[PDB]
Amino acid sequence: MQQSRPASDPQVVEAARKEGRLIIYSSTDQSSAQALLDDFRKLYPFIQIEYNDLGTQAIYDRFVSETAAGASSADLLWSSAMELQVKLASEGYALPYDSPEAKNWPANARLGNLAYSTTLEPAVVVYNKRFLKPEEVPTTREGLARLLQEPRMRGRVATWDPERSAVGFTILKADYDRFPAFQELARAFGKAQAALYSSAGAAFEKVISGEHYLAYGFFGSYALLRQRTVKDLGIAYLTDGTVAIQRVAFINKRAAHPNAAKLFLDYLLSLRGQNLMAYTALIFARRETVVGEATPQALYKAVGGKDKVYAIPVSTEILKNLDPAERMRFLTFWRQAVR
Ligand SMILES: [Cl-]
Ligand code: NA
Structure with missing residues (x-):
């Protein structure tokens, strides 16, 4: 070439x-x-x-x-x-x-x-298709805050620990600085008892096993790479506004x-x-x-x-x-x- x-x-x-x-x-x-x-x-x-x-x-x-x-x-x-x-x-x-x-x-x-x-790597939603079908994975922060009111979602959500991850801090802080709906969504992570991870690998293990159904704020690059060999992993892109590193x-x-x-x-x-x-x-x-x-x-x-x-x-x-x-x-x- x-x-x-x-x-x-x-x-x-x-x-x-x-x-x-x-x-x-x-x-x-x-x-x-x-x-x-x-x-x-x-x-x-x-x-x-x-x-x-x-x-x-x-x-x-x-x-x-x-x-x-x-x-x-x-x-x-x-x-x-x-x-x-x-x-x-x-x-x-x-x-x-x-x-x-x-x-x-x-x-x-x-x-x-x-x-x-x-x-230009977007922060996406990833989910286990055996437990959440694509049509019920919201693509907005308000929608996700609503989903996380459901008792079936309690202990089934992962996101970053911004206190233990520099990239996690950058991405969640970018969200907070830009989207008012982030504040409702953070409260819903409290409601849903969200588990917080210092790495994507640790967060994705739990989503692939079905111990979590959904993970918020991890990057699309890693999600595509895992999806190449895990056909149960779904990716949703936020349509109310996506942050990218x-x-x-x-x-x-x-x-x-x-x-x-x-x-x-x-x-x-x-x-x-x-x-x-x-x-x-x-x-x-x-x-x-x-x-x-x-x-x-x-x-x-x-x-x-x-x-x-x-x-x-x-x-x-x-x-x-x-x-x-x-x-x-x-x-x-x-x-x-x-x-
Ligand atoms: Cl070399
Ligand atoms: Na050159």
Whole structure:
């Protein structure tokens, strides 16, 4: 597929040949990233990749620690912890680089030339079809608050613990900040005795076993990936408004192999990389021209229009989520509503 190679500066490519190495610190499971890594190496066979698959807090702590120690660290950081990525990229850790693959990124998908969105992943409802049929799974927060009044739903609901999950915090806080109906729905998680999880895996186990029937606020990427082998898992998309996270990539200012990192960033943003990510990894692409289920065009059809998707922006505005007063107001609401 020579016609689909990423746009590249020839000087970057020549400097990447001399570097011949790329160190990535990433939150993305290597077995999901593997097809992108294999396809990037076919495009640029002269690069050796070290892919470090780490938890989001681990990436932040390690990179900050190594930098402070003057140590060799990563060339490229790729993480679903939006606030931690935007914090690093707005505190002097990022290499400014205008990606030739990002010319049509919306301003809210890039921190200028410091960091880029690589995904647009919606928070969805998942449910066990043996216990809830698609026609009775509400697609609005008011509808879900009503369903959760039913005694058959008591102890049958999962959501995030925003006190034990950074991504869980980001997604539920985005919901609370944007949708008044969220407050009714949080109260209904209290009524239904919602179980709160620090990971999607722990929450989905219970939904697949039928110990829970429904889970709220987990991401569509993971839900599609589990659904590929669990035919009882249903996905519903919220039509009153969907919140979506964006996995953020940036190049280390102090990268030993900055030109290799530029090629990898361009690849991740390109149609070739975004297509392959949607198709093989079932990670919802950022790029609007991707065709398939895990894509913006499919998401917009499912929710009833692009205007019903709120992307959490790749912007310093999201650092209010780290402000202790803002955190205390949300968490004191949350803990009262759900317990
Ligand atoms: Cl390699
Ligand atoms: Na390039």
